[PDB]
Structures are given as structure tokens and as C-alpha cells.
Amino acid sequence: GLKNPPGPWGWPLIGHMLTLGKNPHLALSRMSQQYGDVLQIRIGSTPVVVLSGLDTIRQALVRQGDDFKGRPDLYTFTLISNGQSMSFSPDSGPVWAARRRLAQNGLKSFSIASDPASSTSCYLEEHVSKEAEVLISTLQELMAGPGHFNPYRYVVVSVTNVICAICFGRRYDHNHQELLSLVNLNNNFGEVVGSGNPADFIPILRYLPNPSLNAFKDLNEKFYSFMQKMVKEHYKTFEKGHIRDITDSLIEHCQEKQLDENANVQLSDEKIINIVLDLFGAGFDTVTTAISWSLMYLVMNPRVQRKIQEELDTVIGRSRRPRLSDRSHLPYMEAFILETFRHSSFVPFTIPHSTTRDTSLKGFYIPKGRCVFVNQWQINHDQKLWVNPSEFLPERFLTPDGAIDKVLSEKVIIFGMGKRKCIGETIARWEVFLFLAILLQRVEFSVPLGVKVDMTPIYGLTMKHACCEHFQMQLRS
Ligand code: HEM
Numbered sequence: 325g326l327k328n329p330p331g332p333w334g335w336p337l338i339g340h341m342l343t344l345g346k347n348p349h350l351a352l353s354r355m356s357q358q359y360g361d362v363l364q365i366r367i368g369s370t371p372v373v374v375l376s377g378l379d380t381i382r383q384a385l386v387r388q389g390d391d392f393k394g395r396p397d398l399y400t401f402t403l404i405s406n407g408q409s410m411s412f413s414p415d416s417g418p419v420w421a422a423r424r425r426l427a428q429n430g431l432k433s434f435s436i437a438s439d440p441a442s443s444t445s446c447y448l449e450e451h452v453s454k455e456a457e458v459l460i461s462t463l464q465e466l467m468a469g470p471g472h473f474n475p476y477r478y479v480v481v482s483v484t485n486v487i488c489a490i491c492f493g494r495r496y497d498h499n500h501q502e503l504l505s506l507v508n509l510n511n512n513f514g515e516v517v518g519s520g521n522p523a524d525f526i527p528i529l530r531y532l533p534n535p536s537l538n539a540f541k542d543l544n545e546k547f548y549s550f551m552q553k554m555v556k557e558h559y560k561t562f563e564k565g566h567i568r569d570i571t572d573s574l575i576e577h578c579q580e581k582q583l584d585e586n587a588n589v590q591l592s593d594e595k596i597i598n599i600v601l602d603l604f605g606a607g608f609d610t611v612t613t614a615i616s617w618s619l620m621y622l623v624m625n626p627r628v629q630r631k632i633q634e635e636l637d638t639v640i641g642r643s644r645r646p647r648l649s650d651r652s653h654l655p656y657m658e659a660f661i662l663e664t665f666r667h668s669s670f671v672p673f674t675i676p677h678s679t680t681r682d683t684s685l686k687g688f689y690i691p692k693g694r695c696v697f698v699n700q701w702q703i704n705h706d707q708k709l710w711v712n713p714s715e716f717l718p719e720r721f722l723t724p725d726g727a728i729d730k731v732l733s734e735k736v737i738i739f740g741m742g743k744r745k746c747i748g749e750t751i752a753r754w755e756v757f758l759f760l761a762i763l764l765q766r767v768e769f770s771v772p773l774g775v776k777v778d779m780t781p782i783y784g785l786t787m788k789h790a791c792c793e794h795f796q797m798q799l800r801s
């Protein structure tokens with residue numbers, strides 16, 4: 325008594341490739357209106373099941389986590405972390421789970437934990453405060469110079485410096501060339517790794533001239549080399565009872581593992597150590613992208629920049645910088661961050677999943693090994709859940725008093741769910757908050773009338789906007 329998931333008809337050789345088009349999240353949302361929460365398509369010859377709906381997605385990822393925690397064996401994933409990525413490899417067994425645990429401990433220990441150098445505050449707040457100021461300074465230098473800027477160029481360095489501090493104990497000047505070459509120079513990582521990339525489904529596209537994929541390979545080689553340069557320096561300078569950062573903790577773990585008698589061979593030193601890259605990659609890109617959207621939204625909705633400015637002044641004043649502890653007392657800042665997440669849904673699909681065994685979901689049979697997409701954009705824009713999905717309205721998360729409506733904030737899905745949920749979620753929420761709170765308390769961003777500011781997401785794993793050279797900032801009265 326179990327059926328196959330329904331879905332539309334497809335071309336016999338390419339399936340639904342052309343229907344996905346350039347915006348698969350939009351196409352598949354429409355498609356779920358007709359066929360429901362569990363539907364099936366084909367890209368090339370590969371079946372993919374696509375999921376939507378809060379509860380359906382919770383049912384699969386959480387209630388049946390183990391069934392759906394896999395990753396499909398895609399070509400493009402074989403190019404990340406030298407084919408041995410924690411996050412993207414086909415391994416979702418005990419080696420994976422162990423790597424996952426080390427990354428979580430790494431994170432907690434070097435972000436949320438108390439900075440020794442500060443009684444009051446944690447590492448993360450320490451690094452974000454430092455970089456927030458440098459950033460302010462830097463933007464000034466440009467207003468006093470050309471009078472406008474592309475904010476991304478500068479945000480990306482500031483944000484990279486935070487996660488860089490945590491992973492590698494280093495930071496970089498806003499003009500360092502090697503860094504800019506890493507995180508601001510043909511970073512199409514997200515573009516190629518987005519759900520539905522044809523190259524992962526049409527074998528010939530891999531071997532044809534493909535500027536995208538070559539760029540993607542060069543990017544991965546560079547990131548890998550950078551990790552390696554950095555790991556060598558940490559080894560050379562390792563101090564045995566002084567763990568400076570995550571890379572040190574992974575070196576330590578490798579060391580400890582050398583005096584096990586039956587040391588497990590599959591959790592290699594390489595797989596223990598390259599963890600630091602998956603963190604660094606995820607950490608710089610998604611958070612940079614989030615703040616970049618937040619800015620675009622501020623500059624297109626001055627009404628909201630002001631309301632936030634007002635809440636900061638009222639709740640904290642211009643007597644001191646804001647702090648993590650003020651997060652709980654700044655519910656309009658929360659509403660604005662939530663609505664940035666909802667409206668942009670800049671991570672529209674999770675990284676694709678895979679079934680780890682035969683299973684069933686809402687009466688549908690799903691065989692082991694089936695590639696599964698998980699459509700978060702659909703949840704965040706569902707017309708049955710939200711009033712004007714298409715409008716930027718922070719106020720939708722506020723009660724009549726002006727407190728955050730908890731039940732409604734919990735329907736923003738942008739970090740996944742279940743076994744493969746973002747492990748960066750708390751850092752990401754605190755980092756965006758602090759960066760915004762510290763910035764908006766002291767400056768104002770704007771763009772002039774009469775210039776094009778494209779607000780159209782460009783598809784990928786993280787969805788970017790086109791570069792905007794017209795940002796302006798002014799200190800506050
Ligand atoms: C706004 C910020 C962020 C968003 C929206 C975000 C979102 C996500 C999403 C949607 C996933 C996919 C879940 C899945 O495949 O089921 C993911 C995975 C992941 N995130 Fe994030 N993330 C963010 C920030 C971070 C940061 C700061 C880090 C690390 C410092 C991080 C580390 C990861 C890692 C390692 C994974 C892979 C987990 C796994 O494969 O098992 N993320 N994140």
C-alpha cells in the first residue's frame with residue numbers, strides 16, 4: 325500500500341532540466357502547488373525527489389533523520405576538499421558523525437567560550453567587535469575618498485576575519501591580495517554547487533569546455549592549498565598545552581589518535597584536519613551573503629533602517645557599543661534579521677540529501693540512494709503561511725505590543741533541520757546581529773535616487789545580488 329511520488333512528465337533524455345531553468349527554487353515551488361509536498365522529477369536520467377512543506381520536511385529530516393541524512397554522489401562534490409569534504413562527500417556514516425562532532429566542539433570552544441583575554445565576553449563577540457570598528461573606519465576612508473562604495477568588497481573581509489580568527493588565529497588587512505584572491509575573486513562556489521547543476525546530471529557537460537567548472541576547480545584547489553599552508557604553519561609552531569584555534573584542536577586530536585593501538589584508519593588525519601576548511605568556507609560565504617542582503621534591504625527600506633536606529637537609541641543609547649546581551653531586548657532587530665532570511669531565502673535549498681535506505685514518506689515509497697532536494701524557499705514564501713510573502717515586512721514577526729511572535733519566527737527555515745542542520749547556526753545568528761547592531765548604532769547607509777540597484781537573487785547554494793557600487797554612509801548626529 326505505497327505509491328511512487330507524483331510529478332510531471334519529462335523529456336525522455338533530459339527530464340525536467342529545462343523546467344528547472346535558471347531559478348529552480350521558483351519552478352519547483354510552482355510545481356509543488358500542483359503535486360504536493362513530495363514530488364519527483366528527473367534531471368538527465370537521474371530521478372530526484374523534491375520536498376516542501378514545514379511538516380513534511382520535519383517529518384523527513386527530523387522524525388526520519390537517519391533515512392534522509394545522506395548526500396548524493398555528485399561530480400561537483402568530488403571537487404571539494406579534495407574529494408573528502410565532511411559536508412559534501414557521500415559519506416554519512418560513523419566517520420561523518422565523528423567529524424561532525426569535532427567540528428561542533430571546535431566551534432563551541434573557539435567562539436562561544438569565554439575569551440581568556442576578556443572576563444566579560446566570548447571570543448565571537450570579541451572578534452566581531454574588533455572587525456566592526458575596523459570596518460567603520462575603512463568605510464569612512466572611502467567616503468572621504470570616492471564618496472561611494474561597493475559594500476561587499478569590505479564586508480567580505482570583515483566577516484572572513486572573524487571565522488578566520490576562530491579557525492586559524494589570524495586576520496587580514498582589507499587590502500591583502502592573497503585573501504581577496506580567495507574570497508573575492510571568481511567565487512562561483514555557490515553557483516556551481518546549487519541544487520540542479522546540469523553538470524552533475526549530464527555527463528558530457530563535464531568534458532566540454534566549461535569556464536564555470538574550471539573556475540570552480542581552481543577555486544577549490546586554492547582553498548585547499550590555503551588550508552594546507554595554514555596547517556603546516558600551525559604544526560611548525562604548535563605549543564603542546566596551548567590550543568589557540570580550531571586548527572590546533574584538530575592537530576591535537578590527530579596527535580592523541582597516534583597512540584591508540586587500533587586507530588581507526590577510515591577517519592584519516594586528512595579527514596580530521598580538512599574539517600577546518602568546511603567551517604571556513606561555510607562561515608565566510610553565508611554570513612557575508614547574509615549581511616550583504618541586510619544592507620541592500622536597509623538602503624531600499626529607509627523606513628526600516630530608521631525604526632532600528634530608533635530601537636537602538638531607546639534601548640541602549642549612544643552611550644556604549646551594543647553587546648550580545650542586548651540581543652534579547654532588541655526585537656525589531658530580530659524581526660529585521662528574520663525577514664531578511666525569509667524574504668531573500670538566500671539559501672533556497674539545503675545542500676542536497678540522499679536516502680540512506682528504503683523508506684517511505686507521506687505514503688510514498690522512496691528507494692535507498694535517491695537524490696533528494698529540500699526546498700526551503702518554498703516554506704518561506706508559502707502563501708498559506710505568510711500574508712504578503714513577496715513584500716519586505718519585518719513587522720510581520722511582531723505582536724501588537726512589539727515583541728517577537730515566537731511561533732511565527734520559528735517558520736523561517738533557512739538553516740535546515742535534523743541530522744544535517746547547519747552547525748554554524750548560533751554563530752551566524754550572533755555574528756549578523758552584532759555586526760548590524762554595532763554598525764547601525766553609529767552609521768547610516770543609503771543609496772541615491774536614480775541609480776539601478778538590482779535586488780534579484782542570482783541562483784546558487786547561496787544566492788547573491790549583483791554588485792552595487794553606489795553605497796553611501798554617513799555618521800550619526
Ligand atoms: C546565515 C548563515 C548560514 C546559513 C543560512 C547556513 C545554512 C546552512 C544550510 C541550509 C545548511 C544545509 C543543511 C543541509 O544540507 O541539510 C548548512 C550546512 C552547514 N553549515 Fe551553515 N549556514 C550558515 C552559517 C554557517 C557558518 C557560520 C558555519 C560555520 C562557521 C556553517 C557551517 C555549516 C556546515 C559545516 C554545514 C554542513 C553540515 C553537514 O553537512 O552535516 N554555517 N548551513
Ligand SMILES: O=c1cc(-c2ccccc2)oc2c1ccc1ccccc12
Nearest residue numbers: 404405411513547601602605606609610
Ligand atoms: O564559498 C563556500 C561556501 C560553502 C558552504 C558550505 C556549507 C554550507 C553553505 C556554504 O562551503 C565552501 C565554500 C568555498 C570553499 C569550500 C571548500 C571546502 C568546503 C566548503 C567550502
